[PDB]
């Protein structure tokens, strides 16, 4: 206490408020850029899904393992997590949704396998003893498809090998700058998602060399691209959550200054009174 301590604390909290306001600004710009990169992904996935509509669902179809709804004995998850803190509850809400569902699955006796994107989930599931089979980390604010090839390759290799029976991606969905939501969505076996090529009965491709060889790589690339889309939407959702969290923290600091200055003024007055009474009643 005493004026000269409380004024130092007020100074430091004002400095803290500068820091958090700057971080809010930065995150607010990076959200706009990350959502632009979000919207720069739709064409590839959408056209490839139309092609798979025609080739696989078609009026004739090609037996592929990824399309058929085989029995479930164990399940894989691809988990997206931030690389940076101060994101609010985003990671822990996501991990609790995942853990609740993975519990529900293991209550039928199925095992589960995790592939981790981002280091926060890596640490969390190393702590909670999850079955992390592969990971990639340090992508930061520059996600790239080439880095994702590793873990998704592992999970594909394990799915075709029959070691996995269903594959999920778990990630946040950006909806509004003020609202994002954690989601778990299946991606193998490939969902039934309309795209009725009945209209396109009028024509058919020249396959070179053959439709089955093409269809295999089309599905592999499509799964990779949906994982990339999920990573970019998660990045944009991280930037939105950091922006709203730093906003809240700046207003918290702004209230703590109001408290500290009342304490400070009380100390100022008390020190003036006790100094002046010590002097005056020390004469005579």
């Amino acid at each position: 206490a005493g004026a000269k301590d409380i004024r130092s604390k007020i100074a430091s909290v004002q400095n803290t408020q500068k820091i958090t306001k700057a971080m809010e600004m930065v995150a607010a710009s990076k959200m706009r850029k990350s959502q632009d990169r979000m919207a720069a992904s739709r064409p590839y996935a959408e056209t490839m899904r139309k092609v798979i509509g025609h080739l696989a669902h078609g009026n004739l179809e090609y037996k592929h393992p990824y399309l058929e709804d085989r029995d479930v004995k164990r399940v894989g998850y691809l988990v997206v997590s931030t690389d940076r803190g101060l994101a609010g509850g985003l990671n822990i809400n996501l991990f609790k949704k995942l853990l609740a569902e993975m519990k529900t699955w293991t209550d039928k006796g199925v095992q589960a396998d995790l592939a981790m994107i981002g280091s926060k989930g890596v640490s969390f599931f190393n702590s909670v003893g999850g079955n992390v089979v592969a990971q990639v980390t340090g992508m930061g604010d520059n996600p790239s498809l080439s880095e994702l090839i590793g873990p998704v390759k592992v999970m594909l290799q394990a799915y075709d090998e029959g070691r996995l029976d269903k594959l999920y991606i778990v990630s946040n969905k950006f909806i509004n700058t003020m609202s994002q939501v954690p989601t778990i969505s299946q991606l193998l076996p490939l969902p039934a998602s309309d795209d009725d090529d009945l209209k396109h009965k009028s024509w058919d491709y020249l396959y070179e060399p053959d439709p089955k060889a093409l269809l295999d790589t089309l599905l592999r690339r499509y799964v990779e691209s949906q994982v990339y889309q999920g990573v970019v939407e998660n990045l944009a959702s991280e930037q939105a959550a950091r922006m709203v969290a730093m906003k809240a923290a700046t207003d918290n600091g702004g209230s703590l200054i109001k408290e500290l200055q009342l304490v400070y003024n009380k100390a100022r007055q008390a020190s003036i009174t006790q100094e002046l009474t010590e002097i005056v009643s020390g004469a005579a």
Partner: protein, 117 residues
């Protein structure tokens, strides 16, 4: 009188554990106040969740205070309270809501109060 020589090891050790938890909770109230509870480490969230229970379980209704709150007073024996605090600290009542501990006698009235919300 709070010496191992006098109150015995178990009581002394429980008291010092309670103090350690509550102090660790004080050291966090500034970061919690500024940045909110979500920036804590996953083990600090547990420290906080246990301190906020210990605080309530230190509450007790008094026979002389029935005038103010209606609820009937309780007498808690020492043997019966070092057990409850040792329990909360060791995390074996760690599945019970905070308000289960508010204004109760022994730890068994808390485990009961949880059932009724």
């Amino acid at each position: 009188q709070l010496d191992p020589l006098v109150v015995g090891q178990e009581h002394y050790d429980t008291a010092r554990g309670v103090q350690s938890i509550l102090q660790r909770y004080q050291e966090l109230k500034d970061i919690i106040a500024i940045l909110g509870m979500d920036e804590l480490s996953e083990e600090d969230k547990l420290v906080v969740a246990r301190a906020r229970k210990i605080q309530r379980f230190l509450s007790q209704p008094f026979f002389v205070a029935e005038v103010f709150t209606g609820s009937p007073g309780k007498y808690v024996s020492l043997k019966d309270t070092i057990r409850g605090f040792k329990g909360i600290m060791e995390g074996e009542y760690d599945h019970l809501p905070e308000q289960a501990f508010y204004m109760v006698g022994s730890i068994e009235e808390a485990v009961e109060k949880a059932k009724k919300l």
